[PDB]
A and B are shown apart, each in its own frame.
Chain A
């Protein structure tokens, strides 16, 4: 089963205060559940639907529309490397090969111990410092393939 905690419900209600329609807090409610649990499980869709007063089909459509709302379980840290055009020119392929060799997984998959999940992302808005890669809260720029193992070690 699934049950929203008190803190999640309070945060969702406070976000509902900011809009004249409670539907407008669906993205932020999904992000609140994702912050507290790493991803949005199946019962969370119906829980958020019950809190907001909108159908669960609408919440599921929002949850599967946006890339940064995870509807499948992830690891403890989400590696998100930029694969867009400026980082392609700056050579993100070395970064992706280094991450694949270090983690022994394909993009979109998770390691055996659930430590890292590898994901390509869109442009991170840091094209003048590319190639960039956003781990859970921190964006790392000016990346080189030899600096990947020293950067992944600090994320236990």
Chain B
């Protein structure tokens, strides 16, 4: 806002945009996008039936699009380096990179940015470093608790 990148007349275009940070009150169901809309309006975070989608009538009945942090962080690279660059990151049907990583009883639990199509054994045996000493690998969840 101090640099003129937010607020009124952003970079002389005339586009007015204001950005707020809404800190939640600790409930998992608020991550659901329609329930996120309900909790943003100060209601009990009950999700909403679709149709209608949030794109037609979302926050306070207005058109509203909900996106993840990582998607909105992927956007500026696309707008700065082009479209064919983003399509030519990986030779897969899922374009672009992704924040992946293994956690739980591994040598190096963490987060790394990898292209799509990277196998999970590659992540486990190269970035995570495999299981720790005296531990036999039994199962794995690819994408969290759900």
* Residues of A bordering B, CB below 8 Å: 18-21, 23-28, 30-31, 54, 58, 61-62, 65-69, 84-86, 89-90, 121-123, 127-130
Contact = CB atoms under 8 A, between A and B. Distances in A.
Nearest to B109: A128
Interface of B: 20, 22-28, 39-45, 60, 101, 103-105, 109-111, 145
Nearest to B106: A128
Nearest to A26: B42
Given A20-B60, A27-B39, A69 B44 contact: no
Given A23-B43, A62-B42, A128 B25 contact: no
A65 B29 CA distance: 11
A67 B26 contact: yes
9 contacts: A23-B43, A26-B42, A27-B39, A54-B42, A65-B44, A65-B45, A66-B24, A67-B26, A122-B28
Given A31-B25, A68-B26, A127-B103, A62 B20 contact: no
A20 B60 CA distance: 8
A121 B104 contact: no
A66 B23 CA distance: 13
A147 B3 CA distance: 45
Contact of B26 (A28, A86, A121, A128): A121
Contact of B111 (A21, A65, A128): A128
B104 A90 contact: yes
Contact of A84 (B60, B111, B145): B145
A128 B110 contact: yes
A27 B103 contact: no
Contacts of B103: 86, 127-128, 130
B104 A27 contact: no
B44 A24 contact: no
B63 to A, nearest CB: 14
A95 B111 CA distance: 25
Contact of A25 (B28, B42, B60, B110): B42
A127 to B, nearest CB: 5
Given A128-B103, A128-B111, A24 B26 contact: no
Nearest to A25: B42
Contacts of B41: 21, 23-24
B43 to A, nearest CB: 7
